[PDB]
Amino acid sequence: ALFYGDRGLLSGYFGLGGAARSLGQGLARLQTGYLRVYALLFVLGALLLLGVMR
């Protein structure tokens, strides 16, 4: 049973890696390729940065 549990622990570490990759591709899907999307995200980030600077 504890061998099974170690198997499950390693599988959970794999699940951590899989969550990392999934989050990564969700952030990668943010780059659609339409220039309007890129300029909108650019302006949003620049406004956010200028707001933080206070």
């Binding site: 990668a28 943010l30 890129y38 980030g45 940065l49």
Partner: protein, 427 residues
Amino acid sequence: MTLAILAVFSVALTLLGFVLPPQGVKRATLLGLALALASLLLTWGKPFAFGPYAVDGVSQVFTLLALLGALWTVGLVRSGRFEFYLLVLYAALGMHLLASTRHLLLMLVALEALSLPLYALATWRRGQGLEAALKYFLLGALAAAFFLYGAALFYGATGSLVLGAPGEGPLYALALGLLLVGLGFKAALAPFHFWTPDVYQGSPTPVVLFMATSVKAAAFAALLRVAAPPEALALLVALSVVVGNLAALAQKEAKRLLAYSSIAHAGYMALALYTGNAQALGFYLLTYVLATGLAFAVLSQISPDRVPLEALRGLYRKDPLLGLAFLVAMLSLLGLPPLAGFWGKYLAFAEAARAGAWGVLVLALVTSAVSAYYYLGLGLAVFARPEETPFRPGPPWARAAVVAAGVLLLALGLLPGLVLPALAAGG
């Protein structure tokens, strides 16, 4: 007075190309850049200023790096258009003027002088190259507008447009933010990073070499002049590293993945901005420039238009030295001992911790440990089975250049107490 050399060579060759074959113009450009590099060597520790043009450690170091990348990428380019060489020279001078000045408006003129040829150099005429050029041009003009209103508000805070002014409160902060926007855009800092993957993917590989060396060098050379507050710096670093590495995990193409890697590395380099060391940052960028130029010369020997991840594989069987150099380069870009990437990473992290920013640094380190996923999916892949991939195994020029770059990466990893003692005034 190296700028004189650059201006003279560019303006002379502009007309001489009508009388000289592209090969002759190529050899002339090579001579001019090598002479400018030598002039930088003989002027080590000889500061020279005329007006807003001011030569300090940053100027010398980063212009040396840019000239190195320019020489390398010219070594590869053989096209029968002298223009495809002239622009290189131009870009060089431009990037030179970017690192060698404190005047904000002269900074804008240098930004334009270096950015204009870079839009056109990416035109192998592939439609995606034009898509990249248009994305690049529009976003760069937007960033130029932002930088310009920042310089305007800076002049609003003080009677001069030269950095080093005392600076007011909120208006000075706003002006500095609007300058940092464009400067980090040139430096591939998030959340301004969107252009980098598309542009790196669409453009021919040697052009991306030239970019990933000289653009980033000159952009950080201009960034060090700014007195960026640490909070905005934390925002940029966190967003850049996190999104860069995460989205780089999901990438299937070599050039796009590497553009994301350059975003993560720009996030790492921005840590020296906590202290503005400009010695550690000079060393870091030296190592990164060498490694990435090497990798992209190899990628050029593989494919100009686009390189898939499988193409990198089996290279050792194809070329032994190339596979070794790609592996070493991947490890150095990971920042692993005893490689110089580790010294640069350590120096930047030391400056950042010395400024007392802990969560950001730890997050950058954890994400850099995450980066081993694809850094290893690239470095080790050299030994895999060669799948279908166009492969042109280069001339001896690029082979010897790659060998020297890799040897220097590992040598500066083992024994940094050789050059790093001379990255300040240069005893």
